[PDB]
Amino acid sequence: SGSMDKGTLGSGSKNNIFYILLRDWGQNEAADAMSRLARLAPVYLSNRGFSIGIGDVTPGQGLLKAKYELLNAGYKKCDEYIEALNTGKLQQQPGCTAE
């Protein structure tokens, strides 16, 4: 079960399958497994096809609407904070000044 990723095949930290092979069956078996992976993964990746285009980074309509709403809300809250600090008393967070 599961799918391989950097957490299991990468050089991040422990629990790597190659690390388990190195610690259980020696160095030669781990080296052979890494060689087989390096000879298998490119072949399948070329036979399947993996590409990125401009359509893979374009935003959607709902995404644009949500972004517009969030920008409006954030700008309104920032204007409210500016008006509260400049004209009136603003709640000062502990350990820092009003600015």
Binding site: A31, S35, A38
Partner: peptide, 13 residues
């Protein structure tokens, strides 16, 4: 001293 280039068809050692 030479520039390097990738080659996956070789072993790690």
């Amino acid at each position: 001293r030479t520039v390097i280039s990738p080659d996956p068809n070789l072993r790690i050692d």
